[PDB]
Point group: C2
Chain length 476, copies 2
């Protein structure tokens, strides 16, 4: 059973919910975690979604090695794990476990690209990534081993690369909004928060109401021509001139599962969106074994599986129905089907939806279509409710004085900002100092969706003219 | 374009082939290779196949960590990679990269398995593995980081575990034989080649005609109860007693790709079985509007098609490129074909050309594709059987090895003998060792007089021997 209350004791709730739901088992190495089926299946669902979508844009998959020579990695960091020996035997030079794959992939890109006919080059990989994170580890959200994909592309023009950046970013919106029912906000990173290797970083950001924190959900970079300068990725154009390629890179990790847990979970435990749940409907026979009820459960299973609904009968002998209800509630199965002798006599079954608790009486013949409609309802309502908590979590302000009260209410702040890089630094400091007295607030993104900006408007901090609205907050 | 000859220098043919098809790029860390799309997509076909099949047996995927603490791994190896630092700082204790995951998975098993209600427990994972191999590395066949799937299961009885050992091994036969059209022999490992932590090790074995080497294609172990005792994987049975569990484990790797390549490849380069080819039919314009219509048509039949309508290459360049890459069928369309209402079609395995009318394409291309696949397999099976010699005594071995053959020979199954045979064969080759590949499930009759071909003692079973990877 789940006992820590979600609003009151968020950290404990989260651990309880991931452990008692059977998603995660703890492990003797810090910041590493076991991903059990109930979590891993969700990762498979989103990997297949995204993979299929990039295969439509002409991206192709590859696998580069997890190892990189120190020489190659330090070409141009305290997080990098170094291998120094195998068995008893010292290596000639230490070797790094990949923390990201630029220094592995880009030298190969310099070899493969010779001519404009080689462009665009579009690759992705799925792989694990290792980083010795300094911060407190958190399962899914921050781990020292995480799973991700990483895309790297090279184009003859900026315009084509930018088109891809945005197309990929829309797929990350989809990953989170369409599969996980988490609402996100597309936006440009500030100068201080963007990938230092690139020209412009775009991002998809999320908000955890229960601790008032923003969190970057995924990232898509327009890298410009600078890696191609560094690594010498050049092409003869059709006029025989030597040109630099234009590059993008993008990634999203097992962090997304965690954001999904935090968003839809409640005091009983998980709530998993139907699109990604391992089991969408659990059949629970009201049994404390004559074979009439399980006979009908099996029948119902077959029937529902014909509509591609994922189903499990919990036919365990030694557990009471109510025990089982709770069990599958902690796991967040979006739908429970109850079948007892009553139900068996009526030709009906009783269905309870995990998001709201609402119960329904449904005739055997209507089950398949009615459970499909219920899952669309559940999926959609999870989203709409989270969207509403997102927009209730953002306070629009005009002045630096509105900042601290807005952070204390566990809110994000949306504010007109001059975008001067020095100012971002000043605001990280000033809100750090002010937080200790009573923690740093930073930029999360400049939203693509800009609320209106009355002609005279001034920066909430410097009072200079204000370019755009920037979304700020405490963050992971 | 490929210039080395497969029957003349095999190593350089292989290198050329996997490089010029754009399957493999070489890398500065020895034993490690870049898998490009053309090779990665074939891995994706066989992974999706096996994955779906183990799902129907109730197996579920997971992901355990790639690190394992010194203490846990060094519990009861020169190949294991050790992490000792983050940035410049050293760790309290060093930490190993997963060479296999018994030591990572089995403590959590001991904790999740309490009763018989919790059995069978069936998990699998896809990951990479790192092993600092001392042998000569070879792309795919033997690499320092390789990709695999490792399956690990726990059962109440040995019967049920064993049942599962064989289901999985049939799935590996299917993986090699149905997807990749590589023929394989199911078998038992001898006591000297079995996984030392298990009871029995079953295997499927493949063969490389051009260097006479056998090669383990995949493996599936009846672990018995010995890991259960060591990790404390006990459960409460029906009667209420504390029973150890019965375990299996099994794995297959990217080595499968290299076996496929070496089996079907020829002097012009790769030949890819239709069942695993990302592109089955490449359409080449030599017009563009009909190419589009034909593609649409062929996809109705689920045929995977690419039109190579890239203007920056000559049609000739395209014939050679898709050839080296092993695309099964190539379809050529000019002005003369356009006005005849037909297409010229060339199959990659035999070079045979067909003239096919637009209406008959989908059914005929489907016919040819089943023929390619059926035929790759069948030639490879005949090539396999021409490579194994039934023998009776030891005096036959060296000549058979020099013909680059395996030998099937009756054996007492004394472990000390296999050891002796290796050294002996080592020494006569110096003047190279031959080991057991497997005891085939398919045993020929053993007449009662018969003697072990080496030691002169009464034989037990027929055993397959040769050099190997
Ligand atoms: N330790 C981690 N565990 C899980 N997901 C992660 C982790 N670090 C980064 N991510 C995700 O991976 C995405 C791209 O990685 P990357 O851009 O390299 O991260 P980053 O910029 O270093 N984020 P941060 O470390 O907070 O500064 C990020 O947007 C995160 O959503
Ligand atoms: N270095 C490697 N690269 C690629 N595939 C491998 C490698 N080593 C083993 N395999 C394959 O993966 C399967 C599972 O590994 P495993 O059986 O534990 O290896 P092994 O017993 O150490 N083989 P070997 O090193 O030849 O004695 C093996 O049976 C091989 O089919
Ligand atoms: O990983 C990236 C860039 C890029 N890699 C591909 C997808 C994600 C995208 O952010 C950023 N990054 C984060 N963290 C680190 C590095 C680093 O480049 C370099 C090694 C030190 C740790
Ligand atoms: O890994 C296995 C057995 C088993 N592991 C699980 C799946 C594959 C199956 O063969 C054998 N093995 C091979 N090589 C090594 C080990 C080892 O156990 C232990 C570490 C040293 C290198
Ligand atoms: Cl330029
Ligand atoms: Mg970081
Ligand atoms: Mg950062
Ligand atoms: Mg080995
Ligand atoms: Mg061995």
């Amino acid at each position: 059973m789940v006992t820590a209350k979600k609003d009151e004791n968020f950290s404990e709730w989260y651990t309880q919910a991931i452990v008692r739901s059977e998603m995660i088992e703890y492990y003797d190495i810090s910041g590493c975690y076991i991903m059990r089926p109930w979590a891993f299946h969700i990762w498979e669902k989103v990997q297949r979604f995204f993979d299929d979508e990039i295969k439509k844009m002409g991206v192709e998959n590859s696998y580069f090695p997890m190892f990189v020579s120190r020489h190659k990695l330090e070409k141009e960091s305290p997080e990098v794990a170094w291998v120094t020996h195998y068995g008893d035997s010292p290596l000639p030079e230490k070797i790094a476990i990949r923390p990201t794959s630029e220094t592995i992939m880009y030298p190969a890109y310099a070899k493969w690209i010779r001519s404009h006919r080689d462009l665009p080059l579009k690759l992705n990989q799925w792989c694990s990534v290792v980083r010795w994170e300094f911060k407190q580890p958190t399962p899914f959200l921050r781990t020292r081993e995480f799973l991700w994909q990483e895309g790297h592309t090279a184009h003859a023009t900026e315009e084509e690369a930018w088109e891809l950046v945005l197309d990929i970013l829309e797929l990350y919106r989809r990953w989170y909004e369409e599969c996980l029912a988490v609402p996100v906000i597309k936006g440009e990173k500030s100068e201080g928060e963007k990938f230092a290797g690139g020209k412009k970083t775009t991002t998809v950001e999320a908000f955890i109401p229960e601790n008032g924190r923003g969190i970057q959900a995924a990232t898509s970079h327009l890298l410009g021509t600078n890696f191609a300068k560094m690594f010498e990725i050049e092409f003869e154009d059709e006029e025989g001139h030597k040109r630099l390629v234009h590059q993008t890179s993008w990634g999203c990790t097992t962090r997304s599962l965690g954001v999904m847990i935090m968003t839809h979970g409640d005091d009983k435990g998980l709530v998993i969106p139907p699109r990604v749940a391992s089991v969408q409907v659990v059949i629970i026979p009201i049994l404390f074994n004559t074979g009439e009820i399980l006979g009908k459960c099996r029948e119902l299973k077959t029937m529902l599986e014909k509509a591609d609904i994922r189903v499990r009968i919990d036919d365990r002998s030694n557990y009471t129905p109510g025990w089982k209800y709770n069990h599958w509630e902690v796991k967040g199965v979006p739908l429970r089907l109850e079948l007892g002798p009553k139900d068996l006599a009526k030709g009906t079954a009783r269905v309870v939806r995990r998001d709201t608790g609402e119960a329904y009486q449904i005739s055997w013949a209507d089950l398949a279509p009615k459970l499909l409609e219920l899952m669309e309802g559940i999926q959609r309502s999870l989203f709409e409710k989270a969207k509403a908590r997102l927009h209730e979590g953002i306070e629009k302000i005009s002045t630096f004085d509105e900042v601290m009260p807005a952070l204390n209410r566990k809110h994000l702040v949306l504010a007109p900002w001059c975008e001067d890089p020095e100012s971002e630094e000043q605001i990280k400091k000033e809100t750090q100092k002010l937080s200790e007295i009573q923690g740093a607030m930073k930029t999360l993104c400049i939203p693509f969706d800009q609320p209106p900006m009355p002609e005279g408007t001034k920066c909430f901090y410097t009072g200079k003219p204000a370019k755009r609205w920037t979304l700020w907050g405490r963050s992971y």
